[PDB]
Amino acid sequence: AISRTNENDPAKHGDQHEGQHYNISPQDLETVFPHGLPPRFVMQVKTFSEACLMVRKPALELLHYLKNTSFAYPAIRYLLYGEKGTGKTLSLCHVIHFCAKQDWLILHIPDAHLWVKNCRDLLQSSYNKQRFDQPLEASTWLKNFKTTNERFL
RNA sequence: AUGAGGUGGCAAGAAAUGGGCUACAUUUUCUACCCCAGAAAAUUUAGC
Ligand SMILES: Nc1ncnc2c1ncn2[C@@H]1O[C@H](COP(=O)(O)OP(=O)(O)OP(=O)(O)O)[C@@H](O)[C@H]1O
Ligand SMILES: [Mg+2]
Ligand SMILES: [Mg+2]
């Protein structure tokens, strides 16, 4: 299995694991990723009966940045960009899985495009009459946020 | 007057058959895009 790596701990991946697939346990799948993974990667997980992510340079660089982050300075914005279907979503998922294992609090938005299109129950906020509420989109995210961060609640 | 005008009136129904016009969707429809997204829901006439 030249394409697999036995190191299933994202905190110990480096340049020597590049191009190799590491396994995410079903517990980690259901806890860390109720909603994150791309729709067509969930089919592969269901068909292969295992979730495996390749270790790539973008994720390695973004993990090296997060390992040396100073928590006293203001939060740094990292933006993954690339051509269509290049793996940036799964790189973000790799980074989320790294952060979850170190008892970070995860605020994961799986797709912000869903909040700006195709909303059937749009309401007007009682808090601020000039804004609109999206109960179906907010309650769906709240359940998965509770699932991911149940310990800290 | 087979020319030019005035006045009023003339409104039509039945089938049997032939044709024409419209919409007819899941391989569909709406939005973004111009193709890796999100939501909704037997007879018979021609042609190659
Ligand atoms: N690190 C990876 N490990 C395994 N498969 C991967 C990886 N990166 C990409 N893939 C494959 O590529 C497919 C698309 O990846 P992904 O959804 O991350 O793309 P993307 O660049 O975020 O796409 P888009 O521009 O459409 O948002 C994944 O479903 C998987 O098949
Ligand atoms: Mg993506
Ligand atoms: Mg008449």
Burial (CB count within 10 angstroms: exposed 0-12, middle 13-18, buried 19+), residue A149: middle
Q: Is A53 helix (H, G, I), strand (E, B) or coil?
A: strand
Cβ atoms of A21 and A53 within 8 Å: the answer is yes
Q: Is A21 helix (H, G, I), strand (E, B) or coil?
A: strand
Q: Count of alpha carbons within 13 Å of A120, Cβ hemisphere only?
A: 1
Cβ of A149 below 6 Å from ligand 1 = no
Nearest CA to ligand 1 atom 9: A87
Residue A79 (CA) to nucleotide B6 (C1'), in angstroms, measures 94
CB under 7 Å from any atom of strand B: which residues?
A 39, 84-85, 113-114, 117-118, 120
Which residues share a beta bridge with A51? A24
Q: Which residues contact A46 (CB under 8 A, 6 or more apart)?
A: none
CA of A10 to the centre of ligand 3 (A): 93
Cβ atoms of A74 and A121 within 8 Å: the answer is no
Looking at chain A, which runs of residues are DSSP E strands?
21-24, 51-54, 123-124, 132-133
User: What b/e sequence results for A68-86 when a residue is b if at least 16 CB atoms lie within 10 Å of its CB, and e otherwise?
Assistant: eeeeeeeeeeeeeeeeeee
Residue A120 (CA) to nucleotide B21 (C1'), in angstroms, measures 39
Gyration radius from chain A CA atoms? 18
Phi, psi of A112, deg, nearest 5: -80, -10
Cβ of A54 below 6 Å from ligand 1 = yes
Cβ of A37 below 6 Å from ligand 1 = no
Q: Is A110 helix (H, G, I), strand (E, B) or coil?
A: coil
Of A104, A106, A93, A105, give the one whose Cα is nearest residue A24. Answer: A93
What DSSP designation does A105 have? Answer: P
* Distance from C-alpha of A102 to C-alpha of A90, rounded to nearest angstrom: 19
* Distance from C-alpha of A27 to C-alpha of A68, rounded to nearest angstrom: 28
